[PDB]
Assembly symmetry: C4
């Protein structure tokens, strides 16, 4: 096991450890994606109820 | 093929397998991004129709 | 250069190529993030204009 | 340290450097995810206030 190859293998291991670390940082930042999807689907639902309220107001005014 | 180099190569392979695994976890979490974009574009569309309804209500009231 | 080490180095290269490929797939899926941010900021703007229209309708009714 | 193994180790290092570079590009693209979550939660809040305004307009009209 040559010292230089040993040193380069340790460099490869260090690089791999940094990539793994960065992947978990990525997975953490992706934790709020299902929160956003949920909130967006809730907004859509609230807007639909609102469209109905405005349509009811349109009816009650046309009298 | 030195045992120690063999053992370190297996460590490199294990690290690579974990990164690959984490990439698929990342790709899975990114599956709901086109759902969010679609929903957001739908909200915008519903809001525009709503703005028109409120503008119509403004007209029908000013009579 | 031992055949077995040669074969394992080629395995390492194949694994690396798959990870690189998966990163570009990830970057592609992340292309619609600035579209979503933009649309969301537009919705907020449209909602504010709407809140004003409803407040104007409240005033015109209280007469 | 065989020249061919040396050359392949340098290829492994180059591949690792490209993946690391791509991870930071990924982390950068993920910077606007907490902006989107925040804006979406703000929209929801504005919509709720709006639903109340329309409900108040419904009351003031039914008189
Ligand atoms: Ca070196
Ligand atoms: Ca070891
Ligand atoms: Ca093998
Ligand atoms: Ca080569």
């Amino acid at each position: 096991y040559d010292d230089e190859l040993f040193s380069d293998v340790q460099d490869i291991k260090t690089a791999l450890a940094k990539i793994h670390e960065d992947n978990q940082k990525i997975i953490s930042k992706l934790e709020s994606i299902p929160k956003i999807k949920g909130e967006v689907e809730s907004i859509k639902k609230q807007i639909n109820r609102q469209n109905i309220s405005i349509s009811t107001l349109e009816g009650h005014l046309s009298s």
